[PDB]
Ligand binder design. Structure first.
Ligand SMILES: NC(=O)c1ccc[n+]([C@@H]2O[C@H](COP(=O)([O-])OP(=O)(O)OC[C@H]3O[C@@H](n4cnc5c(N)ncnc54)[C@H](O)[C@@H]3O)[C@@H](O)[C@H]2O)c1
Ligand SMILES: NC(=O)c1ccc[n+]([C@@H]2O[C@H](COP(=O)([O-])OP(=O)(O)OC[C@H]3O[C@@H](n4cnc5c(N)ncnc54)[C@H](O)[C@@H]3O)[C@@H](O)[C@H]2O)c1
Ligand SMILES: NC(=O)c1ccc[n+]([C@@H]2O[C@H](COP(=O)([O-])OP(=O)(O)OC[C@H]3O[C@@H](n4cnc5c(N)ncnc54)[C@H](O)[C@@H]3O)[C@@H](O)[C@H]2O)c1
Ligand SMILES: NC(=O)c1ccc[n+]([C@@H]2O[C@H](COP(=O)([O-])OP(=O)(O)OC[C@H]3O[C@@H](n4cnc5c(N)ncnc54)[C@H](O)[C@@H]3O)[C@@H](O)[C@H]2O)c1
Ligand SMILES: Nc1ncnc2[nH]cnc12
Ligand SMILES: Nc1ncnc2[nH]cnc12
Ligand SMILES: [K+]
Ligand SMILES: [K+]
Ligand SMILES: [K+]
Ligand SMILES: [K+]
Lengths: 461, 463, 462, 461
């Protein structure tokens, strides 16, 4: 008689379970943590509020936390990223989950609230797992008393880490956090190679457009921009890259990309005259990867080549000025998460109009919105880190400290390199890779232990 | 030429050719020439006396003349016996700059050349700055001329191996002057160490052997910055590349980058026995490249097990990555041409000229890109050497040797340049490609919590 | 008004299909240029075309181009899994007879072809054939030979179908001439190669969502499909090994940077388990067949494959993989449509948590069309512009109206002239925004060509 | 006391021989033919005039022909392509060779005539091996009586095949020829992959320029243009391709290149107004690959970005208008086969002038002029075909046949596919590749012999 959930269709659970069983075989680091810690139950007594894309991969994360002793209440961190069969399998296992693909904004907020409240009252949560900081922000702003019981937050992604660091700087962060993003087995695995796999995947599923031979503009060249540019270049696109960071721009040049700005002299003065119209008029596909606001702006959208594809793979949809397109242009749905935006006006459209753009997932995370996000074998790294971060903070019991001790303990830290290397070794073995063991003389020669860590903390890989 | 005799180079008559190539290189090095124009008037290195030890290439020539143009006097040697470009050395000597370097030095001559920079007219020069690549000059100063370090304000160290040696001295309390780790600027490590080897590894293998690489099997030992660039140098030519690593994080990157990760040893266990060698794997390898900065990562038993006619080379800083001593002791060497030897595994005394059981060793195991070609191209070295100039300016202006003891104790460290300067070097490199960097709006800068002028990333950022 | 001469999965998908056709038209400039160039001339007026080819959105644009040029058609798919149901619905809603849906049974597949051949229970007065793989051509020759007396020609899309035509020609059983559409360069070296480059990894991702980077693939074949397939996987970071029986194609694989291996020790396939390179196959995470041949992923290979390997076929017919052996001996667990786990533990049921299974895509049928949407519109533009030109040419030649003595002189399998191949290519290049340079008169004389082409001798291989 | 030769330096012979011994291990198809036919001596009595780049690879071909029974007299087919240590080794073996790197044009003709003449009179030659048609043309125009005794020509390269087909079309070809170029193990091996290996090799040796991140324009996308474009793209260049053949241009697009013209709308009207000056002003490297005339013309050279590199990898230097540059601009030699061309004027230059182009090999074949051309394991395919072609035409004995039988055989032909396959099989085994053998049922199913040929003659690979 379990009813503490809300999903699109519970009858998808058997399908979800079949895909979970396959996904476990693709996630050796995560499944390895089940075997290594199950006897010790390190999360016994943990009550975790979780807010992250309710995919099949997240299902294996959830059931790992539960297998190690935790109770959880779960929601997705995006309105389009849930896989309904994954949400169904989790609910059918008796786990509170509130998530479906295609939520409204109101339903999204309601879903997070259903994790926070149990039977109309605040749940006795003591841990937080977040992707983007939305759950973290709601707790700090609307339920601050609950944070007096919480031992820590483990944050998945670059945008959420920024929000944590803002609070730490302002002295408004109430509990310590682990920056899971900046494990190398996360940032340089998930953010880069994950988007390499899943960006062209989502574009093909949404449009079935040939990419070879066509012109792309990628805004940003951090980890997501690097992986996105490679996703397109390996398909044969001619990829140009925009950046505000000269070091990242240098990498794009050395990686074989032309570095350009949407704006003359790179100066974004807000006018149509600033736009390089010759450049924008040649672009078949624009992808935003920045975590910044309005990097594909109204004047760029006006200048784009007819029938260009526009999408965003950064965390939030304000990278693209979709508000401008809602106010001024008519949207024609092709199929779910694919809209033609007719630049002829707002008052309806000609079905045979040639002057439109194609927007994917309404500007939301395109790899999760139009496909299934990163593959299991990549998310294995990210989620093995999440499990270790949950154990790490839960075992330190910050919430039980007096205030003076809490102040000394309050931090936003990454996991130690030894754990990063432990995750990596399990990933490598999953590929059948064989790591070489240093001899004693060799370890002494380069100044490391045979067991690692093999690099100083300054190392960038 | 003229009364100036304070140099030793292979052939001073190569100077005009060297000057022609320097003028071309200047056009390829906008960050370095940007610093030359920016600081020429202020002469920030006026009074600096720099001992320099780094590959005497055309690129180093532009570095040397930038330091001199900013006011420094220098005395120079190469940090490798095979890396000098003789026309570069000739052009520098012809400019009146003391340089002791030629391609193909003996080990004794290599040491002599470093000492000729340290000594002027039989007595220590009044040096007050050090620029080093690998730590050889740093070590000679600390061991044999410790009194000279009393007047030296800092060391600017180019490469990973040299930085490791500096950090060991700092931990032991034996480092006498502060240093800047030039290697770990992003416009150095993630430009020079990676993309430089991408350009110059397959370059050197082609010049030495003219072997087709496409379709052949390679084993790259290591997947740090040099191993990453080296693996790409070979894969982009169509080699089937396998990668060995001891670091599981670097091994993970190799897998995701599309390489098979293997070990020369069964189950990765290097117990010193021949039985531990994966002979089936090594018997398929046409090319092995060492990239580690470690010792004996291509060992005797690996060399015995390699496929006949395999090429063996090293692109790490020191030749002890390969057990060439084993090969000198046991096998007959046949020089094909300079820096290319066939190593006949049939025995030590003489060889059959038509023997099929040989390996081809490049540069006698020394840095192959510089030994068999010309190292990294000017436009890549632009980044490394702009950082060197900025590092020399910073430490010279700090004047460590003149500070009170309490201030010395606070500044005796190994530091990197601030990220703002890394970004400023990068911006000039991007402009050199014709790239255009976008300026954040005030609102966008506020949104991500940076200044419009940068820095754009926290110091934790790995790029 | 009362149109019932069709059978599709769901007619209410038509509006969706029409939205996708309107998009595809903007992606197919060569085909739409033919529609615009020839519509007023109506060169296919009087043509009655039996068509058998994957009922995709791309085929919809082809169908409506033929109709726009004056043809009547009756259509079926050439594979049980390749139809896009919204494309079929849009074509039926346009009043065009189409019999096609995704997930046909073999009996339904044959019934659909027969529904194009028969109209109101009697042979339609067809006079042209468009085919992809030769199934319709075979049924006509075997079961409706009297209909071929009135047919002017066959335009055949794919390598396997052309092989079947040439077999009939050498045996003296081919009844009407054909155009080999496959061997236009804007077909074979566009569709067969780059199309599979686009759609192979596409279909694997949609079926399994497996990471491909870092994993080991074996591609059987290195012809045009094998070349494009190998690139589809290598560009994702797979470690790709290639098998071939043709030493020239094997040479290309080596030079392209692949290791060339055989499933069999020393390449010798003696039919025993002992001849299988068990060490090699035990490392393979994905095997793809691309040959047009029979049993190139055989029962002993399937027994030796690494646990949880993915098995798929992108050649025309499913007999490249011995799926019959898997049906007879192993238990099939459906993951979702066109994705099956095949449990090698036995035939009578399976442990839901068994680790010893293979993942088979599309039941061994063409995987790019079965698990995704096949080639993209802008690639199919080239193939289908060639189809329209081939239909025009054979229809205008009117073979069926010739005396028997003249039929014998005209009975052949031919390709389109290079000048038309070039004209298709030029529209494709313009579609990318590319600008082709024009020779000066002196340059044209220097290399011995006309300024307008053709630019290459017929021997040229590109 | 052998003195029937002319080389730069005979003392380089020991070095040349060391490199020949290495090269033999890289050339299994050619050395397999040497071992296979040694007993038969199929070229006994053959007297071959040879004209092809005097490289180490050509040295292995020469000694294979001699090992099969031929006498030869040899010259290079380009003034810059000889490797002097290869020529010296061949001369020190007692084989007449007239070739050095850096011949003048007058010396080039002298070397060919030295092969044609022995002791001041025409040699009793009966076979021709040519690369580009220069020797073929001299024989037809200056020594026509010698062709009465010659059984055939085996021609290496696309440009020479074109010249043979023009002669045949005009009725002026006096002896039959084999088009060696169009074996698949030549055209789609040598012409493509050879240039992939050796184009960026030569640019690096000449200039040591970084290529990654810079802009290249490749003129042509036939086999040489395909291989050249890959040579630059794999280094990270942003490569644009020009073509007059829309089918080749289509391939360029699908292969991920932008297709552009030096001329506005592709129309070359001979004036500066027709040049796309914006495009050419951004180009760092131009490579001509066409076999055509004046495809990098004077107006393009005027418009190129300052300090652009200019080079040609087609057979003849007239692809670039070097005559215009000799007439109008000042040439500064950097080093052999590397010249700065100062666009400031004819009489002298400023040593610090910034307005120059860098020309490689004076517009001659750049891979052979500034490096060593294709590697041994690629030339293995081409030169195995050469040996088979020489055997076939010499055994046919055209010069001995009565006139009507000559008329049946006066043609330009290719080698049979079976032989193409057998060459390829030896190349594959050289990589350690394992070709699978068809079962009898499989061979019947696709309609081939288990032994091949495996493809119809129409097949394009
Ligand atoms: N969709 C996914 O699966 C996924 C995965 C990981 C992260 N993310 C999200 O993607 C975003 C980027 O993550 P990241 O790790 O790459 O961050 P990052 O800091 O590594 O890179 C962002 C880059 O954007 C650049 N940038 C900022 N403003 C710009 C502008 N106006 N124009 C051009 N470039 C600009 C910055 O210089 C920086 O290099 C974040 O929102 C992160 O949460 C998404
Ligand atoms: N030739 C050049 O132009 C050039 C340029 C830069 C640096 N270097 C030199 O190259 C070397 C490598 O520099 P780097 O920056 O890449 O250093 P790095 O620390 O980034 O990488 C070295 C890698 O070797 C691996 N390794 C160590 N021992 C190993 C073993 N036994 N087997 C396999 N892998 C092993 C380490 O795990 C590490 O990832 C140093 O000596 C450096 O000074 C040469
Ligand atoms: N799925 C698609 O969209 C699509 C597209 C075009 C063609 N096709 C089909 O794919 C198949 C291949 O077509 P193609 O154009 O590449 O033909 P092809 O003749 O160019 O290539 C087939 C290759 O298979 C090789 N081969 C044959 N038997 C083999 C064996 N036992 N082991 C290894 N290699 C073997 C042959 O040597 C040949 O090179 C045909 O059935 C064709 O109709 C499919
Ligand atoms: N350097 C080498 O090692 C080497 C090797 C093989 C051949 N070659 C020579 O290279 C040349 C090309 O050989 P190929 O086999 O590639 O010939 P090809 O016929 O395959 O290709 C030449 C291409 O040039 C294109 N072209 C002609 N005029 C053009 C123009 N004005 N603008 C743009 N493109 C134009 C043609 O359309 C054609 O596709 C020949 O001279 C050949 O002898 C050199
Ligand atoms: N060309 C070069 N000059 C100096 N140091 C280098 N290190 C690598 N390449 C170099
Ligand atoms: N190395 C080489 N030898 C002879 N002819 C060639 N053509 C291209 N490269 C060559
Ligand atoms: K997924
Ligand atoms: K250099
Ligand atoms: K499609
Ligand atoms: K060569």
């Amino acid at each position: 008689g379990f009813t503490d959930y809300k999903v699109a269709d519970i009858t998808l659970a058997a399908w979800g379970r079949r895909e979970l069983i396959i996904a476990e075989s693709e996630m050796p680091a995560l499944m390895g943590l089940r075997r290594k810690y199950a006897g010790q139950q390190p999360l016994k007594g943990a009550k975790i509020l979780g807010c992250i894309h309710m995919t099949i991969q997240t299902g294996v994360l959830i059931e790992t936390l539960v297998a190690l002793g935790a109770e959880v209440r779960w929601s997705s961190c995006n309105i389009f990223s849930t896989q309904d069969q994954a949400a169904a399998a989790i609910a059918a296992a008796g786990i509170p989950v509130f998530a479906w693909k295609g939520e409204t904004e109101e339903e999204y907020e309601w879903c997070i609230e259903q994790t926070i409240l149990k039977d109309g009252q605040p749940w006795d949560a003591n841990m937080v797992l977040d992707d983007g900081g939305d759950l973290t922000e709601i707790l700090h702003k609307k339920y601050p008393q609950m944070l007096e019981r919480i031992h820590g937050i483990t944050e998945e992604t670059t945008t959420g880490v920024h929000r944590l660091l803002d609070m730490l700087k302002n002295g408004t962060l109430k509990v310590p956090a682990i920056n899971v993003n900046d494990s190398v087995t996360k940032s340089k695995n998930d953010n880069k190679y994950g988007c390499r796999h899943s960006l062209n995947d989502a574009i093909k599923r949404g449009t079935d457009h040939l990419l070879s031979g066509k012109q792309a503009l990628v805004i940003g060249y951090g980890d997501v921009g690097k992986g996105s540019s490679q996703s397109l270049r390996q398909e044969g696109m001619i990829v140009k890259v925009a950046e505000v960071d000269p070091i990242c721009a240098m990498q794009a040049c050395m990686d074989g990309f032309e570095v350009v700005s949407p704006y003359k002299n790179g100066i974004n003065d807000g006018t149509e005259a600033s736009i390089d119209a010759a450049l924008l008029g040649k672009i078949d596909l624009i992808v935003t990867t920045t975590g910044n606001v309005n990097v594909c702006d109204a004047n760029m959208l006006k200048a784009l080549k007819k029938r260009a594809v526009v999408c965003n793979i950064g965390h939030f949809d304000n990278e693209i000025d979709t508000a401008f397109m809602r106010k001024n242009w008519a949207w024609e749905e092709v199929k779910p998460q694919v809209h033609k935006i007719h630049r002829t006006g707002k008052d309806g459209f000609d079905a045979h109009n040639d002057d439109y753009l194609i927007l994917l997932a309404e500007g939301r995370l395109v790899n999760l919105g139009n496909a299934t996000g990163h593959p299991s074998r990549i998310m294995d790294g990210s989620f093995a880190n999440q499990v270790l971060a949950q154990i790490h903070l839960f075992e330190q019991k910050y919430a039980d400290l007096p205030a003076a001790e809490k102040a000394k303990r309050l931090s936003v830290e990454v996991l130690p390199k030894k754990l990063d290397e432990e995750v990596a070794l399990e990933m490598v073995k999953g590929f059948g890779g064989v790591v070489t063991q240093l001899t004693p003389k060799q370890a002494e020669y380069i100044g490391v232990s045979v067991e690692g860590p093999f690099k100083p903390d300054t190392y960038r890989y």
